[PDB]
Design a protein around this ligand. Structure first.
Ligand SMILES: *[C@@H]1O[C@H](CO)[C@@H](O)[C@H](O)[C@H]1NC(C)=O
Ligand SMILES: C[C@H](CCOc1nccn1C)N(C)C
Ligand SMILES: C[C@H](CCOc1nccn1C)N(C)C
Ligand SMILES: C[C@H](CCOc1nccn1C)N(C)C
Ligand SMILES: C[C@H](CCOc1nccn1C)N(C)C
Ligand SMILES: C[C@H](CCOc1nccn1C)N(C)C
Lengths: 201, 201, 200, 200, 200
């Protein structure tokens, strides 16, 4: 097998429509936000404009191939793959994906998709111009798949943060939750990412 | 049947262009707005910028399958399904869908589609900064299907999912069903009017 | 025939690229604007931002079917049928269609397409804050089909106009024109819609 | 042949990806801008927002048909034919096409494509509020085809210019150029359109 | 072979999803930015709005053809070719491509793709209104292909800068880097382009 064969096979058979659950166990999705920039904060309206890399990993065995004498990994357009239907609950704009929409697939079926996203959120901006800073909580989970189909888990904080931002990051913490909504009888998991940041002073 | 079979079958046969009327009876569509945020309000121009989950349900029997030893539900891209052609009569921007465009289909043919939408409306903003608050009325119905093809009906805490970080707060949400004949066409068109009573904190 | 058959047949045969002229006579298109809102006006720049329902009707016999024991009408995505290439000559933004892009087809081939459109125009805004108001003229016609292929004709004023607009409509009148442009030897028809409005 | 046959044949065979050079001679493209509006001017940033009809003509013999007992012309979506890859060198926004994207094809293979375009440009705005006015130069040519593959030539100046603009046109002149860039060994032709205008 | 054959063959066989690595050696991509305009420099937020031609070259042997008695080059839509997945790490808007999305392919498989791009960046704007000027660093590299699959190298770049900009370019320098990120075990190459500019 070479890359052309692998990509041909994936394109013919991946079934992007089909969640790759194994034996009625949920697909375990890991999500981790690497913050790159904070662009346009408004303490009056409690809105924030943020740029982050959304590191997203999961397993899809239907993509796997025998890597004997073959490439161990390929880059695949996400339109040819099943991707988790993650949404940020407190987003107030649709995600603007700034990078090529390619995922990386390993021969055992492990997938990494890590777009750079600019998005606007509704969150607590109070204290942004103080030494304690503001804490903006971003909540991300599957929109349509309950906890028996998709589970979501969290995997330096300023590591890739732009030095040219007007803001600086004090801390980033994660928390996993499982919530039942009035609409539906089942539980839906999310990861809440708390971004503690402040204006440079 | 597993998920792959069900989704394959739906993709091959659903007919997204065909309204699934049963025996010349209208498709009964239920619509309910769960308000999440009020983002911009302008009392001079009478305009409002709102985020809401549009809970939309209907039945399409052509999607049904025998759920014996099979999954009870699948998530399906709306491009593979018939969806009611709902529109907001007083919208002044196109709906910005913030979430993955997937519907949930139950084995008996019941569909739920519940996108998070940000949209701007023309409505009565007067009184927003008073105790009584403003009442903004949002009118939603089928754009091209009359009352014998689509009926629309309203389906909890109004502020249930409303953001605590909004500058506004919700006092009350009420619904009302209407049937209207327009000058353009001889038939009647149903709508739901959702009255959002809100004020500045 | 049921709806599924009719829509299948339309999808397989409608020919959206082909103007449905009958016997070398023009396709008669009717256009009528129902103003819903006036959102922003600028008297210095002579620009206006308007929302309207563009009621558009024409006949396409290639869509017709025998309605005996069959539905009399279906809703069809406009991508599956021929639609007149109307443009507003004084638009300064592309039309933002706010509604599902569906037309309604009757079994005899009559088509109605009626999108809600938000669009910006260059027009006379002077007098908007006076009793007489401003008169903004919007000119609409086929971009590429001359008068022997497409004719355009006009069919309450503030019937659907929003009560919450800062503006109010005093009068709406229409006028049909036929114009020859320097670029091309033939005549092109348009409808000019005159919107007389003022600040409340 | 009727319109349906002609359009069917064009759709099946036109090859929109293939430049219709004849016998290793360049495709002769004519370009002419008819200015409709000037919407915003900035003398500090030297930027202008303009609306114009871009009259573009060329010949593509692969489109030709025998017009004996047949329509002489059809309107065709530009996605179904080859179109020159023209770009404005000093544009600072992408062209916003305001009109239906249809070209008109004559039976001998002559094509006219004439979209209404709104676009922003970087150019010399100095003098706009004086009697002499400003002269904004717009440079248009093929982006990827050199002079042996595409040649570009120019074909009342205020003829279609909006009376409601804050600006007025004093003169429009054209000039053809042929330029070698550092990137590539070959020459690339352009037309430079000089728009002399001023605030009323 | 004529142009129609070559383009037909490319469309049928190019495999736009497949990186054209040769013998487990990386595809060598060359990138060079030719700055055309600087449109907004926000001294509050450290954000710049820039227009540049992104000259991008690489080799794809699967595109090659025997050029004996045949055209030496064709223009090809990028949707029909593999293109490197380059991204600007400090971009804060998606790239707005202002030009026709065509690449030029030589019979030996050499590809040139050179779009005009408008994009907004986060970078050091301090000193823009001083004699030394500001230095804005733009970092560009493959998003998903590591150093054994794609290498990136720089090929002045201010020759095409608009004379009507409020800004002027003092110097442009490039630097190649190779970086390992926390997410992934391999190294990813980038080119960092330093744009030294100031207000006139
Ligand atoms: C590929 O074939 C080898 C040799 O028999 C086998 O042991 C291995 O399990 C196969 N690889 C994968 C990934 O299954
Ligand atoms: C709160 C949201 C609302 C949307 O949910 C759904 N849409 C289709 C099926 N379901 C369940 N999720 C996370 C339940
Ligand atoms: C007011 C709107 C106008 C649009 O109507 C329609 N467009 C195509 C068919 N129909 C009927 N509806 C609800 C009648
Ligand atoms: C004013 C417009 C200009 C555009 O005309 C055309 N574009 C293609 C063919 N034609 C004729 N029409 C109505 C002549
Ligand atoms: C200056 C512009 C830059 C784009 O050029 C090209 N892109 C692909 C091939 N070529 C040649 N042209 C006109 C040379
Ligand atoms: C910083 C970026 C992040 C995205 O990387 C990737 N996305 C999918 C595979 N890979 C590797 N690269 C260059 C590592």
């Amino acid at each position: 097998l070479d890359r052309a064969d692998i990509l041909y096979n994936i394109r013919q058979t991946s079934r992007p429509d089909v969640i790759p659950t194994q034996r009625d166990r949920p697909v375990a999705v890991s999500v981790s936000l690497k913050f790159i920039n904070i662009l346009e904060v408004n303490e009056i309206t409690n809105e924030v404009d943020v740029v982050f890399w959304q590191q997203t990993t999961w397993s899809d065995r239907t993509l796997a191939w025998n890597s004997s004498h073959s490439p161990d990994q390929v880059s695949v357009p996400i339109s040819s793959l099943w991707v988790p239907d993650l949404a940020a609950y407190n987003a107030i704009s649709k995600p603007e994906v700034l990078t090529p929409q390619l995922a990386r697939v390993v021969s055992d079926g492990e997938v990494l998709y890590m777009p750079s996203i600019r998005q606007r959120f509704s969150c607590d901006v109070s204290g942004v111009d103080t030494e304690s800073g503001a804490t903006c909580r971003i909540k991300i989970g599957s929109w349509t798949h309950h906890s028996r189909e998709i589970s979501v888990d969290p995997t330096d904080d300023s590591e890739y943060f732009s030095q040219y931002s007007r803001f600086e990051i004090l801390d980033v913490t994660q928390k996993k939750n499982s919530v039942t909504y009035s609409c539906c009888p089942e539980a839906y998991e999310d990861v809440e990412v708390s971004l503690n940041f402040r204006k440079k002073g």
